[PDB]
Design a binder for this molecule. Structure first.
Ligand code: MN
Ligand code: MN
Length: 348
């Protein structure tokens, strides 16, 4: 792997017009996937990290906002980074986004961490853009190589034994951290249960305990669920993403939970800022945010609106895709022996 060549080419588009592509070869991206996958498997599924550290929420393929985020926070290894998932889909340059992130994971495996979001799974990113991007610029085989890599991402991270991090949120099935640790990879993300909730659930001040999630997936959880969780496991903060928030960061449950969203002007459909959170050695939290026109800075002004081909799917098309997902997951997608029960199949 010519990693430094790969990275330099991904960064060279800094200062170009947002949208311009980085031309990696099929084997270079195949290399990124296979080596990063090996590193993800060598590391815990429940990461145990230490401050200082910067944490980012969703990026969703907004590659040039990711460059601007690093320009603002520091390019690795100038800062340590944890990303909370959702690197692909919805944006137009998921491939450059994930490839840079995976390259930095190979370049700095001890100072750069990527958690699994609900969009790093085959059933979701098949629909919401990524699969289309791989087919267009490369081939279906490469989308399946990414799927193998995504199936090996860690699911959560604890920073200094006090900040619990995941993409979505808590689970009613999450009683012991050991339940996360015992999950075997490669694995799919199930249609319900602990691994589903960890990547899909949301907080809600209106809920006392657990409530209905408007997505039709997983649940919502209330502030008391947050407080009881923190007290039981002697934590101080939950850090998660998954939800657009006005200023890129938003506190919840007496500032015991924070939502981070790093994609400003998300999909060109919200007036939101993107935020990174800095955690220093003394566990102090602070924020830097990219706003469209606590430290502030102006976000890049380009057209983030993207085509939403899933809205055009016919019932016949949906059926065909479910058949494709089922065949792929049944005959090709590698799944650890102890995790086949988690493989999310679809109704015929
Ligand atoms: Mn999400
Ligand atoms: Mn998201």
């Amino acid at each position: 792997l010519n990693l430094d060549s790969i990275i330099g080419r991904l960064l060279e588009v800094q200062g170009s017009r947002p949208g311009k592509n980085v031309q990696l070869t099929e084997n270079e991206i195949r290399g990124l996937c296979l080596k990063s996958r090996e590193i993800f498997l060598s590391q815990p599924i429940l990461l145990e990290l230490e401050a200082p550290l910067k944490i980012c929420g969703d990026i969703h393929g907004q590659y040039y906002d990711l460059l601007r985020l690093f320009e603002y926070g520091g390019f690795p290894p100038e800062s340590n980074y944890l990303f909370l998932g959702d690197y692909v889909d919805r944006g137009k340059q998921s491939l450059e986004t994930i490839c840079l992130l995976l390259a930095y994971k190979i370049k700095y495996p001890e100072n750069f961490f990527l958690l699994r979001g609900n969009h790093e799974c085959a059933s979701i990113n098949r629909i919401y853009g990524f699969y289309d991007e791989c087919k267009r610029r490369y081939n279906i085989k490469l989308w399946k190589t990414f799927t193998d890599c995504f199936n090996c991402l860690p699911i959560a991270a604890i920073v200094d034994e006090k900040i619990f991090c995941c993409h979505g949120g808590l689970s009613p099935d999450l009683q012991s951290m050991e339940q996360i640790r015992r999950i075997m990879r490669p694995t799919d993300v199930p249609d319900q249960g602990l691994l589903c909730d960890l990547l899909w659930s949301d907080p809600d001040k209106d809920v006392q305990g657990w409530g209905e999630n408007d997505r039709g997936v997983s649940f919502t959880f209330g502030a008391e669920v947050v407080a009881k969780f923190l007290h039981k496991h002697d934590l101080d903060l939950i850090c998660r993403a998954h939800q657009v928030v006005e200023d890129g960061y938003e506190f919840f449950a007496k500032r015991q939970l924070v939502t981070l969203f790093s994609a400003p002007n998300y999909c060109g459909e919200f007036d939101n800022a993107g935020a990174m959170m800095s955690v220093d050695e003394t566990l102090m939290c602070s924020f830097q945010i990219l706003k469209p026109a606590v430290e502030v800075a102006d976000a890049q002004d380009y057209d983030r609106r993207a085509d939403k081909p899933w809205t055009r799917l016919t019932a016949a098309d949906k059926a065909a895709i479910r058949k494709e997902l089922n065949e792929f997951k049944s005959t090709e997608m590698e799944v650890h022996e102890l995790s086949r029960h988690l493989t999310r199949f679809h109704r015929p």
